């Protein structure tokens, strides 16, 4: 034995020496040194100091630059809101708790923080998907006489919020549950504990299939198509230097977007899969924090890729950051 179970938590440390306390009641300095808790807090601090400005600016610059307010940008704004949910639901809370050494807000707080952090990360996830779809639709033109307009943009946004609730909401009402994770200072979805009363096993399969494999398939198909369309277009138009550049830039971007989606979610999926395949294993509190590190950091790198690296947003951001103009 190497864990310690409680009514609604799973401390990844054996109580054979009797030192384990509830992660809702007292510091967990026995499953990690106090300094490592400070580094946890340091990391949440970084993600805020970088994460909030990047994502807030994205909304701000949109309020003040007409040209950004197009239907094809809605999903990107959406991405930025998702990131902020992660910032204020997840990151700030975790900065606060890590410095106490445990999840001082109790089980209900655990349900709130876990819900908003998950909602955030999930809306972001499905945004990145919807965006690949919209790009495929607009560029690959797989539908005769179709024009992407405001209404589709809205459906796309609504679709992400529905898919995200499809993930964050069940654990609030019986299908899986939220419980402190890693170092017990933040709450996630229980995907590593065989907990029958809530049906964790079927939920983990559902998550992996509907919320990882599907997204992965849809992204790969769409951007694969796009890279295909663009390679072909350029080959049939080699007299155009510009078209040759677009083909190269678009290919580079797709490699960055796909690799970036992997880095962000592969760890959660990889780890989840291993625990499912190797039922009951010694997994430490720090190692269980790794998948979170990869996902949560996307609140910074996603907007770098999808906003800062977007020519339009960038210019507007530079103009706004440099006072009047530049």
């Amino acid at each position: 034995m190497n864990g310690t179970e409680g009514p609604n938590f799973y401390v990844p440390f054996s109580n054979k020496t009797g030192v384990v306390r509830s992660p809702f009641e007292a510091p967990q300095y026995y499953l990690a040194e106090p300094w490592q808790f400070s580094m946890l807090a340091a990391y949440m601090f970084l993600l805020i100091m970088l994460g909030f400005p990047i994502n807030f600016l994205t909304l701000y610059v949109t309020v003040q630059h007409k040209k950004l307010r197009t239907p094809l940008n809605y999903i990107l704004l959406n991405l930025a809101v998702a990131d902020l949910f992660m910032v204020f639901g997840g990151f700030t809370t975790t900065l606060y708790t890590s410095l106490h050494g445990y999840f001082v807000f109790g089980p209900t707080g655990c349900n709130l923080e876990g819900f908003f952090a998950t909602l955030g990360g999930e809306i972001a996830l499905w945004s990145l998907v919807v965006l690949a779809i919209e790009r495929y639709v607009v560029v690959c033109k797989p539908m005769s006489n179709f024009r992407f307009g405001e209404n589709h943009a809205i459906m796309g946004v609504a679709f992400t919020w529905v898919m995200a609730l499809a993930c964050a909401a069940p654990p609030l009402v019986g299908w899986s549950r939220y419980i402190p994770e890693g170092m017990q200072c933040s709450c996630g979805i229980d995907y590593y504990t065989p907990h029958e009363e809530t049906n964790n096993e079927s939920f983990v399969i559902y998550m992996f299939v509907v919320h990882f494999i599907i997204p992965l398939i849809v992204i790969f198909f769409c951007y694969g198509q796009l890279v295909f369309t663009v390679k072909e277009a350029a080959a049939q138009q080699q007299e155009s230097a510009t078209t040759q550049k677009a083909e190269k830039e678009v290919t580079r971007m797709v490699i960055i977007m796909v690799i970036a989606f992997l880095i962000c979610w592969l760890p959660y999926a990889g780890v989840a899969f291993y625990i499912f395949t190797h039922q009951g294993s010694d997994f430490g509190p720090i190692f269980m924090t790794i998948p979170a590190f990869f996902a949560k950091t996307s609140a910074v790198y996603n907007p770098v890729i999808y906003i800062m690296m977007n020519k339009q947003f960038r210019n507007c951001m530079v103009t706004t950051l440099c006072c009047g103009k530049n």
């Binding site: 094809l72 990107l76 369309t229």
Partner: peptide, 11 residues
């Protein structure tokens, strides 16, 4: 492609 690539912020 070019206009569309601009619209979706990819070029």
């Amino acid at each position: 492609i070019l206009e569309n690539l601009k619209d979706v912020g990819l070029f």
